[PDB]
Design a protein around this ligand. Structure first.
Ligand code: NI
Length: 341
């Protein structure tokens, strides 16, 4: 049974609610982004209208085989009427194709559902600027002040400089980057660009990337592993055993691996600056954990909400424990008292 925080009151709509069977009263199912926790339940047999971004709709059709007649893609930043209700999709600054959804209820209530997002000051000059929001359904993944991490730009600077130094010292080193979902593509694309290489990967991952509308992508990626000095592997293979095994397969072309694991936050963020990050090393293999986040830091989240001044907040993440829920509610009240809304 569908939980309350996936329902939009006053509508026939649900958000990210595909694992509950047929939802009573639901006339349109929205999907914010193509991550498995959110699409869980969709397949080629789904027969209700799905509303999403163009990029999400490419992935639904090609990766999950959802039939075309049930996929309803909407442009961003454009007022659309769905089953008699005005909606807008906004870029979420998450993974490719990820959206926030603004709903203009028939009774005058306005609701913003963030999906998963990385709040940014640029959102303060979207179509959000123009009107009041009564209810915010908020991605609270990192809703506690211990959650700090650098900008995506600083993390990419570190990765580029690290890779370029290593391969210039040793032209026989291979770079490997871990992946398990869409998102974080800048990591491997920026490293391949500095090295003058295409990124090599499996057929299944190439197929996923070809759905994402990235400009000039055919210039940047390939399935011919032999031609590439940046390879993508499943995240689970990014360990000393899995990398050793991969290096065997490269036919003596390489004698060193430098590997990257983009994570979210890890506790080593509470002590170590990005500039100071060091790898784990065993012989001719080194692995860097880099804190590349596609969710809001605590401070980014707080700035967004204090700017928006919603009347009520409904968290969508960390909702299963009383301790988490009480922590989040305490920070929402601090923010409201400090800003005066
Ligand atoms: Ni996500």
């Amino acid at each position: 049974t569908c939980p309350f925080y996936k329902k939009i009151p006053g509508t026939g709509f649900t958000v990210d609610a595909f694992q509950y069977g047929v939802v009573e009263g639901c006339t349109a199912y929205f999907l914010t982004h193509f991550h498995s926790d959110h699409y869980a339940g969709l397949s080629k047999h789904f027969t209700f209208p799905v509303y999403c971004s163009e990029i999400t709709g490419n992935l639904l059709k090609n990766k999950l085989h959802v039939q075309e007649q049930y996929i309803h893609p909407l442009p961003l930043d454009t007022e659309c009427i769905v089953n008699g209700v005005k909606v807008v999709l906004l870029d979420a600054n998450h993974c490719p194709g990820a959206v926030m959804i603004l709903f203009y209820l028939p009774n005058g209530t306005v609701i913003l559902h963030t999906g998963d997002f990385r709040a940014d000051p640029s959102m303060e000059r979207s179509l959000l600027a123009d009107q009041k929001v009564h209810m915010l359904y908020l991605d609270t993944t990192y809703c506690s002040p211990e959650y700090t991490f650098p900008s995506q730009q600083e993390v990419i600077r570190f990765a580029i400089n690290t890779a370029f130094e290593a391969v210039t010292l040793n032209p026989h080193a291979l770079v490997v980057c871990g992946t398990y979902s869409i998102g974080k593509e800048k990591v491997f694309l920026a490293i391949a660009d500095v090295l003058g290489s295409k990124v090599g990967m499996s057929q299944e991952k190439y197929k996923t990337l070809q759905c994402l509308n990235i400009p000039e992508i055919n210039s940047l990626i390939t399935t011919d592993m032999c031609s590439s000095l940046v390879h993508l592997l499943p995240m689970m293979q990014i360990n000393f055993k899995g990398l050793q095994s991969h290096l065997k397969k490269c036919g003596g072309k390489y004698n060193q691996i430098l590997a990257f694991r983009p994570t979210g936050w890890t506790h080593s963020n509470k002590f170590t600056r990005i500039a100071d990050v060091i790898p784990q090393t065993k012989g001719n293999i080194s692995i860097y954990g880099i804190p590349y986040s596609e969710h809001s830091s605590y401070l980014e989240m707080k700035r967004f909400v204090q700017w928006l001044k919603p009347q009520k907040i409904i968290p969508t993440v960390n909702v299963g424990t009383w301790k988490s829920r009480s922590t989040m509610e305490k920070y929402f009240r601090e923010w409201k008292l400090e800003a005066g809304y």
